[PDB]
A paper describes a structure:
A paradigmatic example for a drug target with a transient binding pocket is the FK506 binding protein 51 (FKBP51), encoded by the FKBP5 gene. FKBP51 is an intracellular protein belonging to the immunophilin family. Like many other members of the FKBPs family, it has a peptidyl-prolyl isomerase (PPIase) activity, can act as a co-chaperone of heat shock protein 90 (Hsp90) and it plays a role in the regulation of steroid hormone receptor activity. In humans, FKBP51 is linked to several stress-related disorders (e.g., anxiety disorders or depression), obesity, type 2 diabetes, and chronic pain.
The iFit ligand class (including its analogs SAFit-FL and SAFit1) were the first molecules capable of selectively inhibiting FKBP51. The binding of these ligands stabilizes a conformational change in the FKBP51 FK1 domain. This conformational change is characterized by the displacement of the F67 side chain which creates a transient-binding pocket to accommodate the iFit ligands. As the G64S variant showed the strongest improvements in the binding affinity of both FKBP51-selective ligands and its role in the formation of the transient binding pocket is not obvious, we decided to explore the molecular basis for the binding affinity enhancement in more detail. With a Kd of 0.09 ± 0.01 nM for SAFit-FL (out/in) and 0.7 ± 0.2 nM for Mcyc-TA (out/out), the affinity of this variant showed a 10- and 34-fold increase, respectively, while no improvement of ligand binding was seen for the canonical inhibitor FK-TA (in/in) 3. Interestingly, for none of the three ligands a direct interaction between the ligand and the newly introduced serine 64 can be observed. In the FKBP51-G64S:SAFit1 (out/in) complex the loop involving serine 64 is slightly shifted and S64 engages in a hydrogen bond with K60. For the binding of SAFit-FL (out/in) only a serine substitution on position 64 shows a strong improvement in binding affinity. Strikingly, in the SAFit1-bound state S64 forms a hydrogen bond with the side chain of lysine 60, which seems not to be possible for the other G64 variants. Taken together, our results for the FKBP51-G64 variants strongly suggest that the improvement of the binding affinity of our conformation-specific ligands is due to a combination of destabilization of unproductive protein conformations, augmented for very favorable cases by specific stabilization of the productive conformation, and not due to novel contacts with the ligand.
Residue numbers in the entry: 13 to 140
Write the structure that this text describes.
Amino acid sequence: GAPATVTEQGEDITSKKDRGVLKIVKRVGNGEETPMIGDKVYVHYKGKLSNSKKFDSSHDRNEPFVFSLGKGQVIKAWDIGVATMKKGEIAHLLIKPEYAYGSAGSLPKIPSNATLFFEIELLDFKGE
Ligand SMILES: COc1ccc(CC[C@@H](OC(=O)[C@@H]2CCCCN2C(=O)[C@H](c2cc(OC)c(OC)c(OC)c2)C2CCCCC2)c2cccc(OCC(=O)O)c2)cc1OC
């Protein structure tokens, strides 16, 4: 399924090349620009724990999910991965614990050493 496709064909977008964040572009976006650190980003997404025990559709549609890029408002994998997206792009991200909640997790929602998967659509981004 989608996570296995990212394992096998995904691009490693980590600085260390440790496969901690793997990406596939599922729908190509518009133009060439991608957001800079400090830009406000607007996304729709859905995500899950790799063991399929929790799923998040809070912003699948409904209200956009909004955060300032590269400011630690989200897990490290998102500041890395959303930054690589074009407006209108849809991407899949597969994320190891070191780029999400680590050995600590975020109990009881996120267990220790959880792998996460997301489908993310970048709607827009704007300068601070
Ligand atoms: C810099 O480090 C961190 C920053 C922020 C957090 C909190 C969780 C942080 O969650 C995340 O960064 C990732 C990626 C963005 C979407 C949410 N997300 C999650 O893991 C999801 C998540 C996690 C949550 O809490 C852990 C949520 O809050 C209850 C949550 O609410 C919608 C969603 C997971 C849910 C289970 C299935 C797997 C996904 C968060 C949650 C909700 C909104 C956020 O920013 C926008 C806003 O405030 O409107 C940020 C943890 C951080 O470190 C572990």
